[PDB]
Amino acid sequence: GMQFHIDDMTCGGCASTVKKTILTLDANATVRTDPATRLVDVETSLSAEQIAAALQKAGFPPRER
Amino acid sequence: GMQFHIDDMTCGGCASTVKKTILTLDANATVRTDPATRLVDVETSLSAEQIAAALQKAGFPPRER
Ligand SMILES: [Ag+]
Ligand SMILES: [Ag+]
Numbered sequence: 253g254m255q256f257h258i259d260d261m262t263c264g265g266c267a268s269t270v271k272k273t274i275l276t277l278d279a280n281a282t283v284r285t286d287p288a289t290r291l292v293d294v295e296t297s298l299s300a301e302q303i304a305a306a307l308q309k310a311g312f313p314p315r316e317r
Numbered sequence: 318g319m320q321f322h323i324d325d326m327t328c329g330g331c332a333s334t335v336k337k338t339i340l341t342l343d344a345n346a347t348v349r350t351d352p353a354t355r356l357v358d359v360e361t362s363l364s365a366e367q368i369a370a371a372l373q374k375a376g377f378p379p380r381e382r
């Protein structure tokens with residue numbers, strides 16, 4: 253996809269931290285977050301594991317979907 | 318919408334600065350950027366003028382669409 257579910261992304265403000273995290277890792281990435289579903293869609297040249305590793309370190313451990 | 322066209326948003330990295338700008342103003346906002354069209358879609362409780370004013374100060378003067 254790539255797509256993650258992030259159980260700890262419980263509001264608009266967590267979603268913003270998630271988005272900023274990813275865009276700091278890859279300024280060319282496209283990220284969509286949905287607080288209703290806790291799903292995060294990412295377009296990036298980076299691997300899923302790289303994105304996940306960053307999300308984990310920021311306190312938002314994901315599961316890849 | 319709200320939607321803007323941002324002529325100075327010429328690559329992925331400008332788009333990232335635009336996105337971060339808006340999410341710093343309103344952590345609950347949803348923002349979509351498209352580097353092919355230089356269009357930025359925003360869901361926010363803030364006014365268009367507030368978003369635009371912030372975008373202007375960051376060096377990304379928009380036109381509302
Ligand atoms: Ag939250
Ligand atoms: Ag919260």
Ligand SMILES: [Ag+]
Nearest residue numbers: 265266267269
């Ligand atoms: Ag949070």
Ligand SMILES: [Ag+]
Nearest residue numbers: 262263265266
């Ligand atoms: Ag929070």
Ligand SMILES: [Ag+]
Nearest residue numbers: 281282283284
């Ligand atoms: Ag994005």
Ligand SMILES: [Ag+]
Nearest residue numbers: 327328330331
């Ligand atoms: Ag640029």
Ligand SMILES: [Ag+]
Nearest residue numbers: 327328330331
């Ligand atoms: Ag550039």
Ligand SMILES: [Ag+]
Nearest residue numbers: 330331332334
């Ligand atoms: Ag730029």
Ligand SMILES: [Ag+]
Nearest residue numbers: 327328330331
């Ligand atoms: Ag640039």
Ligand SMILES: [Ag+]
Nearest residue numbers: 346347348349
């Ligand atoms: Ag957004």
